[PDB]
Design a protein around this ligand. Structure first.
Ligand SMILES: Cc1cc2nc3c(=O)[nH]c(=O)nc-3n(C[C@H](O)[C@H](O)[C@H](O)COP(=O)(O)OP(=O)(O)OC[C@H]3O[C@@H](n4cnc5c(N)ncnc54)[C@H](O)[C@@H]3O)c2cc1C
Length: 346
């Protein structure tokens, strides 16, 4: 059976590894480079690792695994009729198609948006790296993991970092925890502008409700937009993401979707860890081992400079400190710099 996978992010890459010893697997990705770790891109940008350390396996490793890897190749249409994927280089037949098309950075729509950078690919990381090497500074607009990772790693490398954020909540956490994360990153050298909204950007900085912040390098990190256009124009139903059932099946026979592009009951997980877990569960399902991925539960650890933080389950309840570095909810936990305690609470 030919399994074709569009996308070689952590979703598609993990799926391919899990299926290649069993099926005839082809991966199609429009980027000209093999799989690289996105969670490590801030580390690269800040100068802590060489660009090559982002690449865990060479092209020969896809070879050794029996995975046909088609790079610098964009899928234009899915011919469900035939059943083939049409790229610009040609046509790729499938018995099973999995869409792992991921997401793009939400683009800013303000006056002066042409001065704002986003971060999604290694190529964005390269441009951001060269811009902060030219300037010695960055302004970050946002405050999910990408913005805080970036700001934390940049400050730790000794760049001037300014972070502009609406409201005062970070990572969807309560205001106490959000303030603690802020304080810890401040001590590291991050200058925060909370309760602050962008009105416009120009060459030399950004205007907010509460003033003008100087910086020629601005990076916007305000969210993602799932890539659903390939599906949409192939007659596959989409909402915010490609609409899947609890077995990752789309509205189209023989077409599945996983990762940042896939939406199940209003949820897109939005992490590499989730994307890889979905790939594993889908691999089990395709191999006739029924499995029920828990779409609700998230558990992930982020590293913002030296600060490691585990966020586990439901943190939307009322929380209580029971030990050093650990706030639990009564169903969830947040753990600062303690992987051991994070594992046992999960
Ligand atoms: C800076 C940064 C830091 C991050 N840090 C963390 C972290 O610390 N922890 C964490 O869990 N997650 C982190 N993430 C998120 C994680 O990287 C994403 O959740 C993950 O990348 C999603 O994986 P994916 O396989 O679904 O999609 P993607 O990584 O978006 O890959 C989709 C692939 O599909 C390809 N593609 C799309 N359409 C087509 C087409 N039509 N034809 C051919 N190819 C196509 C694209 O080129 C792309 O390679 C971070 C992300 C960024 C950007």
């Amino acid at each position: 059976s030919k399994v074709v996978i569009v996308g070689n992010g952590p979703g598609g890459f993990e799926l391919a590894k899990q299926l290649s010893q069993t099926y005839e697997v082809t991966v199609i990705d429009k980027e000209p480079v093999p799989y690289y770790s996105k969670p490590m891109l801030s580390h690269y940008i800040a100068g802590f690792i060489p660009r090559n350390r982002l690449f865990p396996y060479s092209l020969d490793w896809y070879r050794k695994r029996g995975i046909e890897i088609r790079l610098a190749e964009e899928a234009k249409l899915i011919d469900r009729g035939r059943k083939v994927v049409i790229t610009e280089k040609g046509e790729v037949p499938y018995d099973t198609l999995v869409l792992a098309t991921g997401a793009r950075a939400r683009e800013p729509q303000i006056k002066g948006k042409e001065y704002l950078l986003t971060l999604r690919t290694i190529f964005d990381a390269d441009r951001i790296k060269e811009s902060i090497e030219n300037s010695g500074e960055a302004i970050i607009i946002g405050g999910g993991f990408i913005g805080l990772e970036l700001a934390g790693n940049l400050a730790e490398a000794g760049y001037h970092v300014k972070l502009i954020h609406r409201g005062a909540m970070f990572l969807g956490l309560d205001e106490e925890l959000s303030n603690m994360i802020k304080d810890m990153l401040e001590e590291t050298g991050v200058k925060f502008f909370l309760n602050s909204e962008l009105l416009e950007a120009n060459e030399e900085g950004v205007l907010t409700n509460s003033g003008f912040i100087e910086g020629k390098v601005k990076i916007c990190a305000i969210g993602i937009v799932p890539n659903v256009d390939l599906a949409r124009r192939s007659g596959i139903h989409t909402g915010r993401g490609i609409l899947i059932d609890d077995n990752f099946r789309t509205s189209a026979k023989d077409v599945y979707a996983i990762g940042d592009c896939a939406e199940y009951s209003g949820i897109i997980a939005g992490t590499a860890k989730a994307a890889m877990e979905q790939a594993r569960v889908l691999a089990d399902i395709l191999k006739g081992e029924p499995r029920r991925y828990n779409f609700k539960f998230r558990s992930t650890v982020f590293k913002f400079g030296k600060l490691q933080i585990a966020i586990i389950g439901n943190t939307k309840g009322e929380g209580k400190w029971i030990e050093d570095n650990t706030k639990v909810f009564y169903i969830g936990a947040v753990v600062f710099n303690d992987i051991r305690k994070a594992t046992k609470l999960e």
